[PDB]
């Protein structure tokens, strides 16, 4: 089946009212408009999206919704550097240095927290700046991404 | 003789018996240790700075101080984009986008204000981000500069 339009996002509804099948996406594939998947329940599903969200596909974005069945997007965990800034000035320094390296950056759960894909030089940079950071397996959700130019 | 050492800053001086001649620098000429200038009064000077401030010369830095004559730095006012963030999330976006373009960035007067030299590309980019911005004539003082690494 080939889907051409998203139908919103699981946060807009009560998911327990529905059987939710997922398609698994890598964080770095979320900006694809044309792709094919096998859902976790083995359904053949493709996308050829006319107008995708500019941030890319987010967690819970709904590809298909009929009666009580949903096919929704899950973004796969990846190795992630989590950043804990301690001041507004630090937030500025960090984002500026990370932008200079052109590394992807995402907002974290709090206004002083950020996430970036694990890369050795990124790690080195933060350690160099003396910024508190953690390496974990986590989701890089498109809707949290800081835009390259948008 | 070649000026090899800074002699402090006007902020810390006692001026009663000191007339000041200025060297007028552009914001982009403050970082180099080696340079020559002509003072506002027409004096030729050359520097080759031993233990230069990391960020560069700043407003009021004293290059020469003898007889009772001082030569000190004035950074010329230039066309500057002033950015006023309204949230921490807005600071992060601003600084990340400017960083991405490798444009110069300076701390403003408050934790949410930031300055960058005016360039059309940077202004277009800030307008699209939807952040409060305006261009004024101001000084980009080296000590407010954010650095790379
Ligand atoms: Cl001036």
mmCIF file of C-alpha atoms and ligand atoms in Angstrom:
data_model
loop_
_atom_site.group_PDB
_atom_site.id
_atom_site.type_symbol
_atom_site.label_atom_id
_atom_site.label_comp_id
_atom_site.label_asym_id
_atom_site.label_seq_id
_atom_site.Cartn_x
_atom_site.Cartn_y
_atom_site.Cartn_z
ATOM 1 C CA UNK A 1 0.000 0.000 0.000
ATOM 2 C CA UNK A 2 1.383 3.465 -0.829
ATOM 3 C CA UNK A 3 0.444 6.367 1.443
ATOM 4 C CA UNK A 4 0.457 9.899 0.096
ATOM 5 C CA UNK A 5 -0.750 11.930 3.102
ATOM 6 C CA UNK A 6 -0.055 11.898 6.790
ATOM 7 C CA UNK A 7 -3.081 11.817 9.113
ATOM 8 C CA UNK A 8 -1.727 13.731 12.127
ATOM 9 C CA UNK A 9 -0.061 12.234 15.131
ATOM 10 C CA UNK A 10 -0.887 9.832 17.909
ATOM 11 C CA UNK A 11 -0.810 12.729 20.479
ATOM 12 C CA UNK A 12 -4.028 14.034 18.880
ATOM 13 C CA UNK A 13 -5.978 10.906 19.960
ATOM 14 C CA UNK A 14 -6.265 8.186 22.555
ATOM 15 C CA UNK A 15 -4.028 5.403 21.202
ATOM 16 C CA UNK A 16 -5.668 2.763 23.428
ATOM 17 C CA UNK A 17 -8.786 3.210 21.236
ATOM 18 C CA UNK A 18 -6.757 1.721 18.346
ATOM 19 C CA UNK A 19 -4.423 -1.136 17.261
ATOM 20 C CA UNK A 20 -1.142 0.666 16.488
ATOM 21 C CA UNK A 21 1.308 -1.016 14.082
ATOM 22 C CA UNK A 22 4.712 0.823 13.749
ATOM 23 C CA UNK A 23 7.116 1.439 10.926
ATOM 24 C CA UNK A 24 10.665 1.807 12.276
ATOM 25 C CA UNK A 25 12.752 4.729 10.901
ATOM 26 C CA UNK A 26 16.330 5.690 11.608
ATOM 27 C CA UNK A 27 16.622 9.282 12.808
ATOM 28 C CA UNK A 28 18.647 10.101 9.716
ATOM 29 C CA UNK A 29 15.918 8.764 7.300
ATOM 30 C CA UNK A 30 13.080 10.979 8.640
ATOM 31 C CA UNK A 31 13.419 13.541 5.891
ATOM 32 C CA UNK A 32 12.703 11.001 3.124
ATOM 33 C CA UNK A 33 9.462 11.579 1.208
ATOM 34 C CA UNK A 34 9.600 8.405 -0.933
ATOM 35 C CA UNK A 35 10.445 5.144 0.854
ATOM 36 C CA UNK A 36 9.127 1.588 1.541
ATOM 37 C CA UNK A 37 8.741 -0.315 4.793
ATOM 38 C CA UNK A 38 7.553 -3.491 6.424
ATOM 39 C CA UNK A 39 5.561 -2.693 9.585
ATOM 40 C CA UNK A 40 6.387 -4.649 12.796
ATOM 41 C CA UNK A 41 3.318 -6.675 11.934
ATOM 42 C CA UNK A 42 4.622 -7.487 8.433
ATOM 43 C CA UNK A 43 2.448 -5.177 6.367
ATOM 44 C CA UNK A 44 3.899 -3.808 3.137
ATOM 45 C CA UNK A 45 3.746 -0.005 3.344
ATOM 46 C CA UNK A 46 5.294 2.715 1.241
ATOM 47 C CA UNK A 47 5.307 6.517 1.433
ATOM 48 C CA UNK A 48 5.333 8.996 -1.453
ATOM 49 C CA UNK A 49 4.394 12.066 0.513
ATOM 50 C CA UNK A 50 3.157 15.116 -1.320
ATOM 51 C CA UNK A 51 3.991 17.516 1.543
ATOM 52 C CA UNK A 52 5.886 16.121 4.506
ATOM 53 C CA UNK A 53 6.545 18.088 7.665
ATOM 54 C CA UNK A 54 9.656 20.186 7.024
ATOM 55 C CA UNK A 55 11.315 18.934 10.248
ATOM 56 C CA UNK A 56 10.829 15.406 8.914
ATOM 57 C CA UNK A 57 8.698 12.518 10.191
ATOM 58 C CA UNK A 58 8.285 12.584 14.009
ATOM 59 C CA UNK A 59 7.526 9.894 16.603
ATOM 60 C CA UNK A 60 3.844 8.941 16.411
ATOM 61 C CA UNK A 61 3.197 10.518 12.952
ATOM 62 C CA UNK A 62 0.305 8.591 11.438
ATOM 63 C CA UNK A 63 0.746 7.112 7.955
ATOM 64 C CA UNK A 64 -2.507 5.276 7.937
ATOM 65 C CA UNK A 65 -5.711 5.333 9.976
ATOM 66 C CA UNK A 66 -8.807 3.246 9.191
ATOM 67 C CA UNK A 67 -11.438 2.234 11.787
ATOM 68 C CA UNK A 68 -9.460 1.057 14.856
ATOM 69 C CA UNK A 69 -6.062 0.398 13.092
ATOM 70 C CA UNK A 70 -3.189 2.862 12.889
ATOM 71 C CA UNK A 71 0.158 2.644 11.203
ATOM 72 C CA UNK A 72 2.440 5.149 12.861
ATOM 73 C CA UNK A 73 6.129 6.159 12.772
ATOM 74 C CA UNK A 74 8.603 5.023 15.385
ATOM 75 C CA UNK A 75 12.041 6.491 15.323
ATOM 76 C CA UNK A 76 14.734 3.942 16.319
ATOM 77 C CA UNK A 77 17.033 4.511 19.261
ATOM 78 C CA UNK A 78 20.624 5.567 18.368
ATOM 79 C CA UNK A 79 23.774 6.393 20.230
ATOM 80 C CA UNK A 80 23.286 9.861 21.481
ATOM 81 C CA UNK A 81 25.264 12.487 23.337
ATOM 82 C CA UNK A 82 23.126 14.182 25.882
ATOM 83 C CA UNK A 83 24.138 17.698 26.904
ATOM 84 C CA UNK A 84 23.373 19.449 30.218
ATOM 85 C CA UNK A 85 24.140 23.199 30.027
ATOM 86 C CA UNK A 86 24.258 25.184 33.329
ATOM 87 C CA UNK A 87 23.525 28.778 32.153
ATOM 88 C CA UNK A 88 22.079 30.691 29.290
ATOM 89 C CA UNK A 89 25.603 31.815 28.247
ATOM 90 C CA UNK A 90 26.691 28.179 28.181
ATOM 91 C CA UNK A 91 23.731 27.247 26.037
ATOM 92 C CA UNK A 92 24.964 29.917 23.569
ATOM 93 C CA UNK A 93 28.574 28.716 23.524
ATOM 94 C CA UNK A 94 27.535 25.093 23.049
ATOM 95 C CA UNK A 95 25.080 25.731 20.188
ATOM 96 C CA UNK A 96 27.476 28.066 18.478
ATOM 97 C CA UNK A 97 30.352 25.574 18.658
ATOM 98 C CA UNK A 98 28.164 22.683 17.536
ATOM 99 C CA UNK A 99 26.737 24.763 14.629
ATOM 100 C CA UNK A 100 30.317 25.639 13.619
ATOM 101 C CA UNK A 101 30.986 21.873 13.288
ATOM 102 C CA UNK A 102 27.710 21.480 11.417
ATOM 103 C CA UNK A 103 26.632 18.611 13.655
ATOM 104 C CA UNK A 104 22.904 17.861 14.055
ATOM 105 C CA UNK A 105 21.358 19.309 17.258
ATOM 106 C CA UNK A 106 18.053 18.573 18.971
ATOM 107 C CA UNK A 107 16.281 20.070 22.015
ATOM 108 C CA UNK A 108 16.260 17.825 25.124
ATOM 109 C CA UNK A 109 13.494 17.404 27.680
ATOM 110 C CA UNK A 110 14.396 20.654 29.475
ATOM 111 C CA UNK A 111 15.429 24.102 28.230
ATOM 112 C CA UNK A 112 18.986 23.580 29.350
ATOM 113 C CA UNK A 113 19.260 20.034 27.729
ATOM 114 C CA UNK A 114 20.234 19.031 24.217
ATOM 115 C CA UNK A 115 20.985 15.898 22.216
ATOM 116 C CA UNK A 116 23.328 15.232 19.357
ATOM 117 C CA UNK A 117 24.353 12.086 17.472
ATOM 118 C CA UNK A 118 27.340 10.348 18.948
ATOM 119 C CA UNK A 119 30.465 11.406 17.058
ATOM 120 C CA UNK A 120 34.042 11.243 18.519
ATOM 121 C CA UNK A 121 34.946 14.946 17.669
ATOM 122 C CA UNK A 122 31.621 16.176 19.144
ATOM 123 C CA UNK A 123 32.469 14.280 22.327
ATOM 124 C CA UNK A 124 35.945 15.690 22.286
ATOM 125 C CA UNK A 125 34.606 19.222 21.816
ATOM 126 C CA UNK A 126 32.226 19.072 24.739
ATOM 127 C CA UNK A 127 34.843 17.488 26.995
ATOM 128 C CA UNK A 128 37.152 20.265 25.864
ATOM 129 C CA UNK A 129 34.567 22.900 26.818
ATOM 130 C CA UNK A 130 34.007 21.168 30.136
ATOM 131 C CA UNK A 131 30.346 20.606 29.405
ATOM 132 C CA UNK A 132 28.416 17.919 31.326
ATOM 133 C CA UNK A 133 27.413 15.150 28.925
ATOM 134 C CA UNK A 134 26.298 11.518 28.898
ATOM 135 C CA UNK A 135 26.344 8.921 26.235
ATOM 136 C CA UNK A 136 23.161 6.801 25.920
ATOM 137 C CA UNK A 137 20.808 5.053 23.524
ATOM 138 C CA UNK A 138 17.969 7.548 22.930
ATOM 139 C CA UNK A 139 15.603 8.909 20.224
ATOM 140 C CA UNK A 140 16.395 11.887 17.993
ATOM 141 C CA UNK A 141 12.835 13.021 17.349
ATOM 142 C CA UNK A 142 12.484 15.212 14.229
ATOM 143 C CA UNK A 143 10.244 17.753 15.877
ATOM 144 C CA UNK A 144 13.027 18.563 18.361
ATOM 145 C CA UNK A 145 15.619 19.201 15.665
ATOM 146 C CA UNK A 146 17.241 22.652 15.443
ATOM 147 C CA UNK A 147 16.928 23.663 11.801
ATOM 148 C CA UNK A 148 19.999 23.921 9.481
ATOM 149 C CA UNK A 149 18.203 26.866 7.802
ATOM 150 C CA UNK A 150 14.477 27.015 8.763
ATOM 151 C CA UNK B 1 60.398 50.706 19.109
ATOM 152 C CA UNK B 2 58.030 47.768 18.557
ATOM 153 C CA UNK B 3 55.286 47.570 21.156
ATOM 154 C CA UNK B 4 55.561 44.128 22.681
ATOM 155 C CA UNK B 5 53.389 44.507 25.743
ATOM 156 C CA UNK B 6 49.968 45.983 26.606
ATOM 157 C CA UNK B 7 50.075 48.443 29.475
ATOM 158 C CA UNK B 8 46.637 47.719 30.951
ATOM 159 C CA UNK B 9 43.402 49.551 30.134
ATOM 160 C CA UNK B 10 42.149 53.114 30.591
ATOM 161 C CA UNK B 11 39.483 51.783 32.969
ATOM 162 C CA UNK B 12 42.325 51.213 35.555
ATOM 163 C CA UNK B 13 44.358 54.401 34.869
ATOM 164 C CA UNK B 14 44.705 57.756 36.809
ATOM 165 C CA UNK B 15 44.251 60.345 34.023
ATOM 166 C CA UNK B 16 44.904 63.681 35.764
ATOM 167 C CA UNK B 17 48.261 64.033 34.126
ATOM 168 C CA UNK B 18 47.636 61.939 30.954
ATOM 169 C CA UNK B 19 46.523 63.037 27.464
ATOM 170 C CA UNK B 20 45.227 60.119 25.333
ATOM 171 C CA UNK B 21 45.882 59.652 21.604
ATOM 172 C CA UNK B 22 43.690 56.888 20.068
ATOM 173 C CA UNK B 23 44.331 54.165 17.550
ATOM 174 C CA UNK B 24 41.045 53.558 15.747
ATOM 175 C CA UNK B 25 40.622 49.901 14.938
ATOM 176 C CA UNK B 26 37.970 48.028 12.927
ATOM 177 C CA UNK B 27 36.267 45.237 14.862
ATOM 178 C CA UNK B 28 37.898 42.697 12.582
ATOM 179 C CA UNK B 29 41.502 43.916 13.176
ATOM 180 C CA UNK B 30 41.567 43.371 16.947
ATOM 181 C CA UNK B 31 42.824 39.746 17.139
ATOM 182 C CA UNK B 32 46.221 39.860 15.514
ATOM 183 C CA UNK B 33 49.360 40.267 17.673
ATOM 184 C CA UNK B 34 51.362 41.862 14.885
ATOM 185 C CA UNK B 35 50.202 45.088 13.176
ATOM 186 C CA UNK B 36 50.983 48.670 12.432
ATOM 187 C CA UNK B 37 48.757 51.658 12.847
ATOM 188 C CA UNK B 38 48.775 55.436 12.585
ATOM 189 C CA UNK B 39 47.158 57.165 15.570
ATOM 190 C CA UNK B 40 44.385 59.666 15.308
ATOM 191 C CA UNK B 41 47.178 62.219 15.925
ATOM 192 C CA UNK B 42 49.376 60.922 13.077
ATOM 193 C CA UNK B 43 51.878 58.840 15.122
ATOM 194 C CA UNK B 44 53.125 55.626 13.444
ATOM 195 C CA UNK B 45 53.240 52.632 15.765
ATOM 196 C CA UNK B 46 53.959 48.899 15.346
ATOM 197 C CA UNK B 47 52.991 46.041 17.673
ATOM 198 C CA UNK B 48 54.306 42.564 18.086
ATOM 199 C CA UNK B 49 52.463 41.494 21.268
ATOM 200 C CA UNK B 50 53.978 38.940 23.617
ATOM 201 C CA UNK B 51 51.080 37.995 25.864
ATOM 202 C CA UNK B 52 48.116 39.292 23.891
ATOM 203 C CA UNK B 53 44.552 38.905 25.264
ATOM 204 C CA UNK B 54 43.201 35.693 23.844
ATOM 205 C CA UNK B 55 40.052 37.348 22.408
ATOM 206 C CA UNK B 56 42.023 40.341 21.062
ATOM 207 C CA UNK B 57 42.408 44.010 21.803
ATOM 208 C CA UNK B 58 39.562 45.669 23.501
ATOM 209 C CA UNK B 59 38.236 49.124 23.912
ATOM 210 C CA UNK B 60 40.582 51.240 26.052
ATOM 211 C CA UNK B 61 43.504 48.907 25.937
ATOM 212 C CA UNK B 62 46.720 50.891 26.387
ATOM 213 C CA UNK B 63 49.468 50.252 23.807
ATOM 214 C CA UNK B 64 51.928 52.968 24.931
ATOM 215 C CA UNK B 65 52.391 55.041 28.008
ATOM 216 C CA UNK B 66 55.376 57.363 28.382
ATOM 217 C CA UNK B 67 56.409 60.894 29.189
ATOM 218 C CA UNK B 68 52.811 61.738 29.988
ATOM 219 C CA UNK B 69 51.412 60.367 26.642
ATOM 220 C CA UNK B 70 49.060 57.405 26.212
ATOM 221 C CA UNK B 71 47.970 55.660 23.070
ATOM 222 C CA UNK B 72 44.887 53.512 23.634
ATOM 223 C CA UNK B 73 42.519 51.402 21.410
ATOM 224 C CA UNK B 74 39.173 52.617 20.183
ATOM 225 C CA UNK B 75 37.146 50.087 18.239
ATOM 226 C CA UNK B 76 35.194 51.917 15.575
ATOM 227 C CA UNK B 77 31.358 51.725 15.672
ATOM 228 C CA UNK B 78 30.086 49.633 12.813
ATOM 229 C CA UNK B 79 26.847 48.319 11.385
ATOM 230 C CA UNK B 80 25.732 45.552 13.796
ATOM 231 C CA UNK B 81 22.742 43.220 13.933
ATOM 232 C CA UNK B 82 21.268 43.277 17.464
ATOM 233 C CA UNK B 83 19.275 40.164 18.269
ATOM 234 C CA UNK B 84 16.872 39.903 21.205
ATOM 235 C CA UNK B 85 15.968 36.291 22.136
ATOM 236 C CA UNK B 86 12.802 35.790 24.086
ATOM 237 C CA UNK B 87 13.523 32.307 25.385
ATOM 238 C CA UNK B 88 16.363 29.926 26.036
ATOM 239 C CA UNK B 89 15.156 27.761 23.122
ATOM 240 C CA UNK B 90 15.525 30.945 20.966
ATOM 241 C CA UNK B 91 19.112 31.534 22.149
ATOM 242 C CA UNK B 92 20.046 27.977 21.179
ATOM 243 C CA UNK B 93 18.515 28.327 17.679
ATOM 244 C CA UNK B 94 20.166 31.704 17.071
ATOM 245 C CA UNK B 95 23.546 30.695 18.159
ATOM 246 C CA UNK B 96 23.409 27.352 16.325
ATOM 247 C CA UNK B 97 22.359 28.975 13.066
ATOM 248 C CA UNK B 98 24.917 31.726 13.209
ATOM 249 C CA UNK B 99 27.540 29.083 14.143
ATOM 250 C CA UNK B 100 26.483 27.073 11.042
ATOM 251 C CA UNK B 101 27.286 30.052 8.831
ATOM 252 C CA UNK B 102 30.549 30.616 10.736
ATOM 253 C CA UNK B 103 29.544 34.233 11.341
ATOM 254 C CA UNK B 104 31.158 36.215 14.191
ATOM 255 C CA UNK B 105 28.970 36.297 17.361
ATOM 256 C CA UNK B 106 29.161 38.535 20.498
ATOM 257 C CA UNK B 107 27.412 38.496 23.877
ATOM 258 C CA UNK B 108 25.017 41.482 24.175
ATOM 259 C CA UNK B 109 24.243 43.514 27.278
ATOM 260 C CA UNK B 110 21.836 40.892 28.829
ATOM 261 C CA UNK B 111 21.853 37.019 28.768
ATOM 262 C CA UNK B 112 19.240 37.087 25.988
ATOM 263 C CA UNK B 113 20.820 39.686 23.656
ATOM 264 C CA UNK B 114 23.471 38.963 21.040
ATOM 265 C CA UNK B 115 25.320 40.949 18.323
ATOM 266 C CA UNK B 116 26.796 40.015 14.964
ATOM 267 C CA UNK B 117 28.328 42.167 12.250
ATOM 268 C CA UNK B 118 25.798 43.096 9.643
ATOM 269 C CA UNK B 119 25.864 40.911 6.525
ATOM 270 C CA UNK B 120 22.864 40.475 4.298
ATOM 271 C CA UNK B 121 22.972 36.582 4.610
ATOM 272 C CA UNK B 122 22.935 36.750 8.407
ATOM 273 C CA UNK B 123 20.143 39.276 8.471
ATOM 274 C CA UNK B 124 18.050 37.184 6.039
ATOM 275 C CA UNK B 125 18.639 34.164 8.177
ATOM 276 C CA UNK B 126 17.539 35.893 11.410
ATOM 277 C CA UNK B 127 14.421 37.319 9.783
ATOM 278 C CA UNK B 128 13.405 33.788 8.687
ATOM 279 C CA UNK B 129 13.995 32.402 12.208
ATOM 280 C CA UNK B 130 11.364 34.813 13.375
ATOM 281 C CA UNK B 131 13.560 36.402 16.091
ATOM 282 C CA UNK B 132 13.413 40.144 17.119
ATOM 283 C CA UNK B 133 16.279 41.914 15.383
ATOM 284 C CA UNK B 134 17.503 45.301 14.365
ATOM 285 C CA UNK B 135 20.552 46.928 12.860
ATOM 286 C CA UNK B 136 22.279 49.843 14.734
ATOM 287 C CA UNK B 137 25.758 51.470 14.720
ATOM 288 C CA UNK B 138 27.611 49.859 17.689
ATOM 289 C CA UNK B 139 31.009 48.571 18.801
ATOM 290 C CA UNK B 140 31.924 44.909 18.623
ATOM 291 C CA UNK B 141 34.181 44.684 21.684
ATOM 292 C CA UNK B 142 36.541 41.703 21.468
ATOM 293 C CA UNK B 143 35.946 40.640 25.027
ATOM 294 C CA UNK B 144 32.259 39.829 24.271
ATOM 295 C CA UNK B 145 33.197 37.627 21.340
ATOM 296 C CA UNK B 146 32.216 33.934 21.329
ATOM 297 C CA UNK B 147 35.043 31.670 19.997
ATOM 298 C CA UNK B 148 35.483 28.372 18.008
ATOM 299 C CA UNK B 149 37.786 25.415 18.628
HETATM 300 CL CL1 LIG C 1 34.157 55.305 17.298
#
